[PDB]
Design an enzyme around this catalytic site. Structure first.
Site, short mmCIF file in Angstrom:
data_model
loop_
_atom_site.label_atom_id
_atom_site.label_comp_id
_atom_site.label_asym_id
_atom_site.label_seq_id
_atom_site.Cartn_x
_atom_site.Cartn_y
_atom_site.Cartn_z
N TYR A 1 0.79 -1.22 0.00
CA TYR A 1 0.00 0.00 0.00
C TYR A 1 0.80 1.24 0.00
CZ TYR A 1 -4.73 -1.81 0.66
OH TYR A 1 -5.97 -2.37 0.56
N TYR B 1 -10.21 3.39 -3.21
CA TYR B 1 -10.67 3.76 -4.55
C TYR B 1 -11.99 4.47 -4.59
CZ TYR B 1 -6.97 1.09 -7.00
OH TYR B 1 -5.76 0.71 -7.53
N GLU C 1 -0.51 -1.85 -8.29
CA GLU C 1 -1.25 -2.89 -8.99
C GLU C 1 -0.54 -3.63 -10.05
OE1 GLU C 1 -3.77 -3.66 -7.33
OE2 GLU C 1 -4.80 -1.88 -6.73
N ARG D 1 1.59 -6.32 -8.51
CA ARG D 1 0.84 -7.47 -7.95
C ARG D 1 0.41 -8.37 -9.08
NH1 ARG D 1 -1.51 -3.96 -3.04
NH2 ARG D 1 -2.58 -2.53 -4.43
N1 LIG Z 1 -3.21 3.17 -1.12
C1 LIG Z 1 -3.35 2.03 -1.73
N2 LIG Z 1 -2.22 1.38 -2.08
C2 LIG Z 1 -2.41 0.22 -2.67
N3 LIG Z 1 -3.54 -0.41 -2.94
C3 LIG Z 1 -4.72 0.21 -2.56
C4 LIG Z 1 -6.01 -0.08 -2.71
C5 LIG Z 1 -6.63 -1.40 -3.31
O1 LIG Z 1 -7.99 -1.49 -3.13
C6 LIG Z 1 -8.22 -2.89 -3.08
C7 LIG Z 1 -9.43 -3.22 -2.20
O2 LIG Z 1 -9.73 -2.52 -0.96
P1 LIG Z 1 -11.22 -2.71 -0.35
O3 LIG Z 1 -11.37 -4.17 -0.18
O4 LIG Z 1 -11.32 -1.98 1.15
O5 LIG Z 1 -12.24 -1.95 -1.17
C8 LIG Z 1 -7.02 -3.69 -2.85
O6 LIG Z 1 -6.49 -4.19 -4.08
C9 LIG Z 1 -6.09 -2.55 -2.53
O7 LIG Z 1 -4.77 -2.89 -2.78
N4 LIG Z 1 -6.79 0.91 -2.20
N5 LIG Z 1 -5.93 1.82 -1.84
C10 LIG Z 1 -4.63 1.47 -2.03
#
Ligand SMILES: Nc1ncnc2c([C@@H]3O[C@H](COP(=O)(O)O)[C@@H](O)[C@H]3O)n[nH]c12
Length: 262
Positions: A72, A123, A176, A179
């Site tokens: 993250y 998101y 992303e 991953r």
């Molecule tokens: N600051 C961040 N850095 C990396 N990934 C995420 C995400 C991505 O959002 C996805 C799902 O989150 P939720 O399950 O709470 O909606 C995951 O893949 C997560 O990695 N949100 N914010 C992010």
């Protein structure tokens, strides 16, 4: 905490693939793997963080802070005024973690400044400040990453819509793509033009936890209970074995416990 350098302003697809292969190696635990896919570490492994220094056109730069556990993006820093480091922590980072972002992004006390990100990293939130219904109505691409860096890096005021836009393109193209080998490939296939995220990339994003759990727990190659996913067209896709999904996935999220290694 190692920093991985990537120049956005001048690139080719080999350079992008070398960068992501470098972030992956750097982030993965050195030994944990389930069915040949590397696993991200336990919160205890030191170093806990990876830094990604994005270099754009015009001597504009942003350093991205990433937690190795779940990749993250905790916030970012940009060179500000003559000799200052301006760090920006996401609103959902708290406790020791907040001090860590300060300390690791801008290691030199006496020259650092705050400008917080007044919203969280999820998101739906990001889409909202972007003023869009879904990320898919905002295009991704190397030129776009570059210009976005350009709208933020070292500028005095920039607005929440500009900042959410930057963050949506950066998290998808750095965290992303690392991953998912599929999103890395979506970027390579469209390397000289903007593209809009297809359903399969948005699906894979949101189901990464469940995929990680599923492959970890899969016995003799077969998954615990079939994984319903979405393909690039919109259709429902049903996977039953780890061979089906394993081509698209480069990194597993931490899930404790033993799993079939290789
Ligand atoms: N600051 C961040 N850095 C990396 N990934 C995420 C995400 C991505 O959002 C996805 C799902 O989150 P939720 O399950 O709470 O909606 C995951 O893949 C997560 O990695 N949100 N914010 C992010």
């Amino acid at each position: 905490v190692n920093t991985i350098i990537y120049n956005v302003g001048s690139t080719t697809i080999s350079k992008y693939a070398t960068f992501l292969n470098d972030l992956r190696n750097e982030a993965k635990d050195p030994s944990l793997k389930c069915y040949g896919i590397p696993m991200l570490p336990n919160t205890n492994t030191n170093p806990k963080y990876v830094l990604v220094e994005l270099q754009g056109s015009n001597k504009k730069t942003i350093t991205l802070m990433l937690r190795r556990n779940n990749l993250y993006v905790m916030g970012y820093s940009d060179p500000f005024e003559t000799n200052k480091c301006r760090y920006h922590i996401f609103n959902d980072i708290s406790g020791t973690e907040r001090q860590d972002v300060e300390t690791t992004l801008c290691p030199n006390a006496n020259s650092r400044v705050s400008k917080n990100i007044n919203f969280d990293s999820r998101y739906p939130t990001l889409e909202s400040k972007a003023g869009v219904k879904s990320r898919s109505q905002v295009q991704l691409g190397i030129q776009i990453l570059d210009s976005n860096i350009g709208k933020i890096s070292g500028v005095m005021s920039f607005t929440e819509k500009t900042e959410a836009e930057f963050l949506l393109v950066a998290i998808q193209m750095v965290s992303e793509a690392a991953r998912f080998k599929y999103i890395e490939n979506q970027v390579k296939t469209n390397f000289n033009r903007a593209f809009n995220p297809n359903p399969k990339v948005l699906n894979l994003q949101e189901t990464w936890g469940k995929i990680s759990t599923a492959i970890h727990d899969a016995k003799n190659g077969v998954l615990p209970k079939p994984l319903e996913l979405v393909d690039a067209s919109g259709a429902k896709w049903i996977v039953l074995r780890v061979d089906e999904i394993k081509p698209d996935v480069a990194l597993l999220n931490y899930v404790g416990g033993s799993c079939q290694t290789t």
